[PDB]
Design a protein around this ligand. Structure first.
Ligand SMILES: Cc1[nH]c(/C=C2\C(=O)N=C3CC=C(C(=O)N[C@H](C)c4ccc(F)cc4)C=C32)c(C)c1NC(=O)c1ccoc1
Length: 503
């Protein structure tokens, strides 16, 4: 439901309005041709015009397909790629990959196949585009078009930019709403943080902390921040909309009182990726419990409620006793200097509680006091049943290790150590991260699974930053606002908005 005059709102500005952007934009190689979604498409579209650069883009696309291809079908896809791109007489022959590297893969495919067979060649291709083909695209109309999109991205975001519909859930310092961008129509989840509730409770640094962490991290398994604006009496965070309910609901209301091992395996594999992306920013979540694992419309999961997340300084440990009863690692209950370990303890609580149907330290029918639940986390060894395969028992007790020094994933290797666990012996992570594995449960669409100080003005400056770059560009692509607006002159000629002669 895009606005009536959305083409006027997203109307491209004349390229002369983008001179300040031309020189302030860092021209990093693939910060503009890969990371930034629209930038990637425009550079790709720049190569579509050239005959030589054409075949280099088609090759990379074919390599991406090989990485997710099933195992028994690798040797097949492998041959197709070489006979199409690496044969010297091909119509789409790759040249900048030296003959001393096409004969290399000749030996790779002569043996068993590995999903990273063409990795050597792919890097060689990018290394070529990084040079002349990139600097050419910089002086091309597509980069001028890229600046036009950036101009729109940076525009101020206010309240008329959106269209709240209902209040879906309420929590601390505010509540959550269902927000919609008018010009694009995309549905988001607004987070109305009441302004006078923050200053009273003196939690201004905790609000910023979550807002900075959310914008810095993007992922398919953690709620993303697309906008952050200030308003009268409230401060808003525009986050991903999750209509599939939480994992607590599906474990106890719509299961056994639990899941099958294979079903829990899926959700676990996605949660692990969600934690890996948060650790790439050396950020610890510390709030891993079933009601915080939400499901989207397709059946996939994301982590939410990062209010307790904090960015750990590299080589430094934090101290704090936060979390929810039962889901606090022993090192957190002890109030010690810990790192990212509490999340792997939480992941152990999650996998266990999904398969068995109860907390590993409190029965579903047991009524115990906070003190006793805590003693078991520190003094009691969990017990397993015939619902856990020998691989499912191992990962849970390894992740539920009391001593965070011998806990899985808490080594220099990180989350990579967990993915290699036999419990994920049947999980292809490259295909999961690509969204190619069908979720085990698909939520139904109609389902309903449920004062004037100046210092206050200074705190707003760092919060109300505006639209987040990557989520914003994707929104333009999702809503097909890019497909419609990204139009040029007929027969590869400059359009009016990109002609410095007549504005
Ligand atoms: C669609 C939808 N999203 C959400 C919710 C979210 C979302 O989507 N993304 C995110 C990201 C982060 C949070 C988050 O920080 N939370 C904590 C607890 C919080 C903190 C401060 C507050 F002030 C309020 C809450 C929530 C969400 C909810 C409920 C529905 N409602 C249903 O799913 C539904 C429909 C019928 O029945 C139930």
């Amino acid at each position: 439901g895009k606005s009536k005059k959305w083409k006027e709102i997203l109307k491209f500005p004349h390229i002369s309005q983008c001179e300040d952007l031309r020189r302030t934009i860092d021209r990093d190689y693939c910060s503009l041709c890969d990371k930034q979604p629209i930038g990637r498409l425009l550079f790709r579209q720049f190569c579509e015009t050239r005959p030589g650069l054409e075949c280099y883009i088609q090759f990379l696309d074919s390599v991406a397909e090989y990485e997710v291809t099933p195992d028994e079908k690798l040797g097949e896809k492998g041959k197709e790629i070489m006979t199409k791109y690496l044969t010297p007489k091909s119509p789409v022959f790759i040249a900048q990959v030296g003959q001393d590297l096409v004969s290399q893969t000749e030996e790779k495919l002569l043996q068993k196949p590995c999903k990273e067979l063409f990795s050597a060649c792919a890097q060689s291709v990018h290394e070529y585009l990084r040079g002349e083909p990139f600097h050419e695209y910089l002086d091309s109309m597509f980069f001028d078009r890229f600046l036009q999109w950036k101009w729109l991205e940076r525009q101020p975001v206010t309240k008329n930019t959106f269209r709240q519909y209902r209040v879906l859930g309420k929590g601390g310092f505010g509540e959550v709403c269902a927000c919609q961008v008018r010009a694009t129509g995309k549905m988001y989840a607004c987070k109305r943080l009441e302004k006078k509730r923050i200053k009273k409770r003196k939690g201004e640094s905790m609000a910023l902390n979550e807002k900075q962490i959310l914008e810095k991290v993007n992922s398919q398994f953690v709620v993303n921040l697309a906008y952050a604006y200030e308003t009268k009496d409230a401060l808003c965070l525009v986050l991903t909309i999750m209509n599939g309910g939480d994992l607590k609901f599906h474990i106890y209301n719509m299961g056994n009182p639990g899941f099958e091992e294979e079903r829990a395996l899926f959700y676990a594999a996605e949660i692990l990726c969600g934690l890996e992306d948060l650790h790439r920013e050396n950020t610890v979540y510390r709030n891993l419990k079933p009601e915080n694992i939400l499901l989207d419309d397709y059946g996939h999961i994301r982590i939410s409620d990062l209010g307790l997340a904090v960015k750990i300084p590299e080589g430094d440990l934090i101290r704090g006793r936060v979390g929810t009863v039962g889901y606090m690692a022993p090192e957190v209950l002890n109030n010690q200097r810990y790192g990212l370990s509490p999340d792997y303890w939480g992941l152990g609580c999650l996998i266990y509680e999904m398969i068995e149907g109860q907390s590993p330290f409190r029965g579903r029918k047991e009524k115990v006091k906070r003190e006793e639940v805590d003693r078991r986390v520190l003094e009691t060894e969990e017990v397993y049943s015939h619902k856990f395969s020998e691989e499912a028992k191992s990962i849970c007790k390894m992740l539920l290790t009391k001593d965070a020094k011998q806990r899985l994933g808490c080594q220099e290797e990180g989350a990579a150590e967990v993915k290699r666990h036999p419990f994920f012996r049947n999980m292809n992570f490259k295909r999961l991260e690509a969204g190619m594995l069908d979720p085990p449960f698909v939520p139904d669409p109609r389902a309903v699974y449920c004062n004037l100080d100046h210092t206050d003005d200074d705190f707003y400056s760092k919060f109300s930053t505006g639209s987040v770059s990557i989520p914003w560009q994707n929104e333009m692509i999702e809503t097909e606002c890019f497909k419609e607006l990204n139009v040029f002159g007929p027969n590869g000629t400059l359009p009016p908005d990109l002609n410095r002669n007549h504005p």
